[PDB]
Write a protein that binds this ligand. Structure first.
Ligand SMILES: CCS(=O)(=O)c1ccc(OC)c(Nc2ncc(-c3cccc(-c4ccccn4)c3)o2)c1
Length: 261
């Protein structure tokens, strides 16, 4: 796929590497990455042919997908010979949503505390992010609170780059579709309104779990849910993928719940 260096290429000498974020992804300070005379903290993914290929692929897909507030956006890349391949994306200061919500378990009240407004807001933003990804004809496949990051001003962003999150048709037919992401989104909702719990608490994930799931067994309401939010989870977990809401419908609906809240 093409790479427009004019548009995306960023000088390696304007990146100052910092602390690692994981397995390599590092914090860095980038000067002028948005064309203003500012220093900004960014996240850098860096590096076999196989692996060079995988990272370039990721870069070209981020370019193909393009920009939305509720995804972790591409900012630039260092691809020119004479240094490591580096893919530069937005840095999300508060880390992943699951770990963050767990840390606020004692700092939550329904109405620096989290509130229902915050949880419904995060839910709404992820749905908008997914509506966007669907319109670019993407499928996420691993839509989970650990893959949502929290940035400043309560902006949440989907990482675009586990049987407990999988739709029944995905387990039983290896099917990943956008409607199977809607199922996962329901599990993500549960994660939000449990403030970062693991889904299916105490339940062993075996052939019996899968059986009960195909049969219609579902998680009970999590501790901090509204009844409207639990109903939405049940809707996302419809056994017939075509009877699940679409992401556009979830955006409209969560927007109404948010606006009403
Ligand atoms: C790396 C684990 S994390 O996603 O929870 C995380 C932890 C701390 C963070 O900041 C203090 C962030 N912030 C962040 N901004 C961007 C990214 C990012 C971008 C691409 C890949 C990864 C990554 C690296 C290793 C494992 C999972 N994701 C993170 O992480 C994320």
């Amino acid at each position: 796929l093409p790479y427009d260096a004019s548009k995306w290429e960023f000088p390696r000498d304007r990146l100052k590497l910092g602390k690692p974020l994981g397995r390599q992804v590092i914090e860095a300070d980038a000067f002028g990455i948005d064309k203003t005379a500012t220093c900004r903290t960014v996240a850098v993914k860096m590096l076999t042919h196989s692996e060079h290929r995988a990272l370039m692929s990721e870069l070209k897909i981020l370019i193909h997908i393009g920009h939305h507030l509720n995804v972790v956006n591409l900012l630039g890349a260092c691809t020119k010979p004479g240094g490591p391949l580096m893919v530069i994306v937005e840095f999300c200061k508060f880390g992943n949503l699951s770990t963050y919500l767990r840390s606020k378990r004692n700092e939550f009240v329904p109405y620096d505390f989290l509130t229902l407004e915050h949880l419904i807001c995060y839910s709404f933003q992820v749905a908008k992010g997914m509506e966007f990804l669907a319109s670019r004809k993407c499928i996420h496949r691993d839509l989970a609170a650990r893959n949502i990051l929290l940035s400043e001003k309560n902006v949440v962003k989907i990482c675009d780059f586990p049987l407990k999150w999988m739709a029944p048709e995905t387990i039983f037919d290896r099917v990943y579709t956008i409607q199977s992401d809607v199922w996962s989104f329901g599990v993500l909702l549960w994660e939000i309104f449990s403030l970062g719990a693991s889904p299916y608490p105490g339940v062993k994930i075996d052939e019996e779990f899968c059986r009960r799931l195909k049969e219609g067994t579902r998680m009970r309401a999590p501790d901090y849910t509204t009844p409207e939010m639990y109903q939405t989870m049940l809707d996302c977990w419809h056994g017939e993928p075509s009877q699940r809401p679409t992401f556009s419908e979830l955006v409209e609906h969560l927007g109404n719940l948010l606006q009403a809240n």
